[PDB]
């Protein structure tokens, strides 16, 4: 994608697109950068993640609005009004699935296989879990179970590496645990597993904060607060 643009120019333009809040452009620039075939630095991995999180986030928010309207239309006493709500929800759903499939394709061709360091491998396997989780949010057919299992398997492999290779305050390790706990709660119907994971992760991070500089302490405690926010909603 963007095959005639230099890799450095694609990265530079992704940063400009981020400043301009042009996330579809940012994602396209980063997709082009990945397709150059070189590994991504930590900053470049963050740009890839920010770009697609914002694109899929808009699609998810729209899908939730449309799904709610569609569910209300299927209640007792609701007037017919036709196929339009379902059609338009399906359109948005298909577009969201396409974005997820594109991110999963980048991870599979060939980000994950070329990621040897723990920081890069865990980042990409967390992303794989996240985008299968977004596919799961809208899945209703005979592959929902396989989609859920793919998300679980990616998060589990990421968690196994993170626990062996990263300290408990590492922001990627923390964000992974946060998102896997949300997977348990919202996708896997395992609220107790979600609560246990969030609590253990929070407590183990708290016990390690003494090792950190002021800036690393700020980074870790910001994510810890998100675990606490979920625990307060769930308990």
């Amino acid at each position: 994608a963007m095959g005639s643009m230099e890799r450095a120019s694609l990265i530079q333009k992704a940063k400009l697109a981020e400043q301009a809040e042009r996330y579809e452009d940012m994602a396209a620039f980063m997709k082009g950068a990945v397709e150059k075939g070189e590994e991504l630095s930590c900053e470049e991995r963050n740009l890839l993640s920010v770009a697609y999180k914002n694109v899929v986030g808009g699609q998810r928010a729209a899908w939730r609005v449309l799904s709610s309207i569609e569910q209300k239309s299927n209640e007792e006493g609701s007037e017919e009004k036709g196929p339009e709500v379902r059609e338009y929800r399906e359109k948005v759903e298909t577009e969201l699935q396409g974005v997820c499939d594109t991110v999963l394709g980048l991870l599979d061709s060939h980000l994950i296989k070329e990621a040897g360091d723990a920081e890069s491998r865990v980042f990409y396997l967390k992303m794989k879990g996240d985008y299968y989780r977004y596919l799961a949010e809208v899945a209703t057919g005979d592959d929902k179970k396989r989609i859920i299992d793919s998300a679980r398997s990616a998060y589990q492999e990421a968690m196994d590496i993170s626990k062996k290779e990263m300290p408990p305050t590492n922001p990627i390790r923390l964000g992974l645990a946060l998102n896997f706990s949300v997977f348990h709660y919202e996708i896997a119907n395992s609220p107790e597993e979600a609560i246990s994971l969030a609590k253990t992760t929070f407590d183990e991070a708290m016990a390690d904060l003494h090792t950190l500089s002021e800036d690393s302490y700020k980074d870790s405690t910001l994510i810890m607060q998100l675990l606490r926010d979920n625990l307060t909603l769930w308990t």
């Binding site: 967390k126 996240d130 923390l174 964000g175 992974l176 946060l178 998102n179 949300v182 709660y185 919202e186 994510i223 998100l226 926010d229 979920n230 909603l233 769930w234």
Partner: peptide, 8 residues
């Protein structure tokens, strides 16, 4: 819930 609910 927040992902990184609150999500990451």
């Amino acid at each position: 819930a927040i992902s990184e609910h609150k999500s990451d």
